[PDB]
Design a protein around this ligand. Sequence first.
Ligand code: MG
Ligand code: MG
Lengths: 104, 189, 143, 145, 144, 55, 75, 68, 171
Amino acid sequence: AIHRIRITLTSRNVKSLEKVCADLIRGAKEKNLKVKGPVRMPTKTLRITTRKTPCGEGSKTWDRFQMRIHKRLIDLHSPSEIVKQITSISIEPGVEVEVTIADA
Amino acid sequence: DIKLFGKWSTDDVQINDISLQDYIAVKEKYAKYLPHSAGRYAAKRFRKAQCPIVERLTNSMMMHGRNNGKKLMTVRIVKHAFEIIHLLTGENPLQVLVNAIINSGPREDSTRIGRAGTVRRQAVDVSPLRRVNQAIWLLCTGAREAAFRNIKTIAECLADELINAAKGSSNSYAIKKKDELERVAKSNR
Amino acid sequence: PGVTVKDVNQQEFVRALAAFLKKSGKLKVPEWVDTVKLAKHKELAPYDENWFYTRAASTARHLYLRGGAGVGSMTKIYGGRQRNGVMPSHFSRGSKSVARRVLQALEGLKMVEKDQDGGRKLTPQGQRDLDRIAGQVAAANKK
Amino acid sequence: MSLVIPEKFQHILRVLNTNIDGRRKIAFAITAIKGVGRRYAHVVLRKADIDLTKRAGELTEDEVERVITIMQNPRQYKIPDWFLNRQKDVKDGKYSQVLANGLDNKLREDLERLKKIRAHRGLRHFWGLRVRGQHTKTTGRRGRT
Amino acid sequence: SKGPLQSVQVFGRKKTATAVAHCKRGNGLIKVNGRPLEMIEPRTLQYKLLEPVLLLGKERFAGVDIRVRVKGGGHVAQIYAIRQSISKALVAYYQKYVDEASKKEIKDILIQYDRTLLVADPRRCESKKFGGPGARARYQKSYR
Amino acid sequence: GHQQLYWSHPRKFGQGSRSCRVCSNRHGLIRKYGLNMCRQCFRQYAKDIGFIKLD
Amino acid sequence: RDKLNNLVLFDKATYDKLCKEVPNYKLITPAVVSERLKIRGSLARAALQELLSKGLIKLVSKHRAQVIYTRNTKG
Amino acid sequence: MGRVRTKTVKKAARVIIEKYYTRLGNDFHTNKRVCEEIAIIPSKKLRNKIAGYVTHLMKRIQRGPVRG
Amino acid sequence: MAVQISKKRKFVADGIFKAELNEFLTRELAEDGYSGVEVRVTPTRTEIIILATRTQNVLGEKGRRIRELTAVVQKRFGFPEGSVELYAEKVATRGLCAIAQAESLRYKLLGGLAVRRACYGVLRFIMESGAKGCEVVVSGKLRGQRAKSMKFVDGLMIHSGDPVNYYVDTA
RNA sequence: CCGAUAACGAACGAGACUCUGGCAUGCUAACUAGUUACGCGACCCCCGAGCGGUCGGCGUCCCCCAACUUCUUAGAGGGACAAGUGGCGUUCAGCCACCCGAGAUUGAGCAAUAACAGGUCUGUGAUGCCCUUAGAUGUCCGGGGCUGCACGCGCGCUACACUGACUGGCUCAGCGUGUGCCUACCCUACGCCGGCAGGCGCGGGUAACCCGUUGAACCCCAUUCGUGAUGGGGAUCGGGGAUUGCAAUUAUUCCCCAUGAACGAGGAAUUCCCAGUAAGUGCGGGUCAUAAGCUUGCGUUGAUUAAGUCCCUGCCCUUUGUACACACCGCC
Ligand SMILES: [Mg+2]
Ligand SMILES: [Mg+2]
């Protein structure tokens, strides 16, 4: 077994996040594990504003850099065991995956 | 039926001259319960014409740095001023305000660029919208320097400014400046 | 027609609660109520003499509105604008000892009890007292 | 309460060695005494048990001498220790509020003590410059020219 | 008699201040955050709060239980959010559970009294730029 | 001299305790998000870290 | 326009001056009472609430920054 | 003011009109619905702007012999 | 938990690792036609792929040099042993890689070819490999002491907007 | 852009593009977001209501032991195009007004050829040449200095008060950060002591889980003050108490009590700005062992005026004159 697991996927780009969150759940449906819906957490916007010039001479122009971090949560819940059933991950570079259980 | 501030029905107020009856907005289509409405009246030209003049007075009464967002304070100032003028005169505060606007709007001014005769080269009559704008600005300014450094509060100062303007007594800064402008324009004719 | 505290204006309500707390005086009033300022950012002591009762009434009303508020939370409510003189103004918090002593006097009157977790809330009979005073002030305002 | 002016209403008083305006409120009239401010005046009136909503000119002799006594000797009337000006005096280490030109001569003796020991703060006081580390480059010009 | 499941939940916005009115069949009452409508902190805007009620009449409000929750913005933004939310909740209730005849001959009064009672104000803010204190003003410049 | 005075001056804090992780500079560091990189070096490498410009 | 040296407490000359025509004109505010009786203004507020207690002046506004009074109706 | 169309939309509109004059119509939505399969438009804004110009040019065509 | 750092710092550290590894590979494999580095990180292990033109040159005698670099990247960042694998991949259409062409131009200039002929050759090779356009700018102490800049551009070249990011490769 | 047309065919820039804000009761999804309903409760009314009212009290993803996504979040999609109507127009390119509409001009980012002896060699293990290199211009350690003051200037903060100050009560945000490779230094709930600054124990949080429902300020409601250099202003200055550090004097910062100085709206001059804008107002980040009058962002309140012109300062195109070409700061 009686297990209930949580898989969180985080990266910088929505295209790869969406395709992972799609193919994983489609594999789950084809492998008849009932799926708790994908929860899209609020985006983390890392902002850094820095003076453009390396000198301090100029018109005081500031360059602003952003890093968008998006994360999704999918809860895999089955009456039987889960980890022995699902072993493949099919994870491309860029996206980071973390799997916990209900105890953690 | 609308009863601005809960009283002072609008339907009895009459504008005495047709020059400003398309720019004063006290009639029942523009009668509002309270002079506060985020109506986007500055989005397009001539949109302030259909803005109620009590709203205009509230917006122009909040000036000089300390008071640029204190619209609730300005609304309470206008309410107290209407109470005071009603007690002092007995007629409609809206009627007093309309008469003050009419008597404060300067019918002509002077404007040019080149070698000035007295103030400007040419004497030019003004638009009704400019009449209303100048009248409201003059009334608020007169109330402000009336209330600046004396014990008499801003409510009474605005009240007696409108009272003096609605009749014409040379005791109000609005019509004093109006007469000065008229004399300058007449000299610049 | 039952009356709760949310159906009456909180200003004269807290005034009436302070008056009741004054007339039925069983508080643990500290010895420094005549000297201390109510906050770091204030520059004079409160004008009213029995300000402690008004403050305790306000704390009871706030605890009714939301429970589990500790001393730091109450200082967050009673914080204000510190003018800082020539420097630009900022925000300051209330007096921690004042809030603590008000709360301790409240559980001395046993209308406030600590939670299972941190902070303290109102007891059922404290809620009863608040509602009764709300009803009587509603009646006074009506007729 | 809102009566006529009382018969024994002196317009200014004589407290210690300075006069105070009796036209203003009592809580702010004795603030004209050097060494007394809004907080000190309020606390001494509170512990003197005098109505704060009355002017200083309408007080009586017993009330004013009670104020005198409490101002002169705050320690024995439950004025807390941390509230006084000359706390932990450099000469005798005794906690005392100072109320009059005693404050002026105490400032004088402390400044001349600093000058005598030739400390940097005392030398700055002698030269008329800032003593709290402020920048003297761009400000303080009026005091010199 | 005892017809259940008669409720709508309609929101209104004014400067990121959202207000959700839960209109429901019952006796006529309107409450905001558990407090009476006529009793709010900026009582100057009590007329703005009561404006839909004064326009439409207590009879159309006599059959509705409305509870409004606000969790954003400032004070007057809250007030405008509540009035818009109440108006939109009433027109949604009249559009769903009774005829659009009544819906239209209340919506017209609402519109040609105040368009903002039923249409949200899109203007929110504007980002500050790195040349001045605000969105458009610039820091004072000097030449000598 | 010996070990007792060569590096004895404390640098557990302050600007001298921090240096750029790239160029060992001690001015214009960015410690936000544990970056520990110079102001100029961050502009140099922001494409590589992933900080890209949007507005 | 130099100074006002306004009275802080009433006297015999101004007490009856207050009592016999202040509840006779249309506008009674502490500011106008102060400026036409040459008194301070806290005195004006206190006198006006005393006359409220006596009941010969009708309050209309009662606002924290602008309080307005009037005389009683005739007829 | 500032609603002048550019070559990118004008040339594309003329080309698709001369190619699919039978399928096109005077309805803006119908034209913007034929555009996605008669042409590859990288942007929705570009697609609908081209569709609007197609409506204008077809009104002009049905009222007279436009150079297209 | 307490042992793992937050997501913000973790992503920033990943970017720092990518940048440091890329700078190291640029300064080390410069003469071997270095083009780029791609890291595929998994909790089990990580794979570093070096896109370079001369794979047989970046791989030393029986992989001695790739083993050396694998050990270096092992020791510098302190991975668990046997948890990182380094592969070398030959790029496709090396004329389209601005990094490789800039490195080749630098190699030619260091060899001593005339800058005019070398830049013409680089441009011709890029357009022969097939691109919508190319632009090479050489700045510095050309000819005399006074510095000059020569720009050789042909074909199409956009400069503004978003599509420059994924259409123009700049080195 | 339409059009003419010794040009035809192109290329860059502009536009297109990306992000952002506004509408989606349409779709997907939510115990790290909630709503509705129901059940335990706690309180008021109990005259009698009782499917009465309040609850940020406890529960119903504790797994069978409710549903749903309106509110919040974030993805895929839609939506706006001068599309429709009237007028003007060579009846073209387009412009004006209006209807319906969330929106009929949301703000940014990117940004051409050619240049400047514009700024940085004090960002770099970017760097040529020159200088120094053991009594060092390397490097380390101690102390001082970068703050130093007859004076002038620039960016700012605080004010000159009653549209206010004080005192108390009531009541509302959104950006965004938070425990470290070196590297020691995180955000803090709650309880207790102290008047305050602070201190002492218990926890939570590597985070839509905790701070935090970010109880912010302004504002609102009552009190005192009363036209005075006054309860405006808080500079200067004395004494005392804590905090950081290895160290606080030339005061790091903070707290308390005293002193209330100029300042009563500012000459000649001059800056910025067109709608959620200016301005008032606070709150985050950077700097940070200690810390913001700075800067970069965020939210709250919210206007006056204008929909024009080339008059001043400039910019673009065409014609024109030139003795200028380092180009009118020219030449003579
Ligand atoms: Mg562009
Ligand atoms: Mg004071």
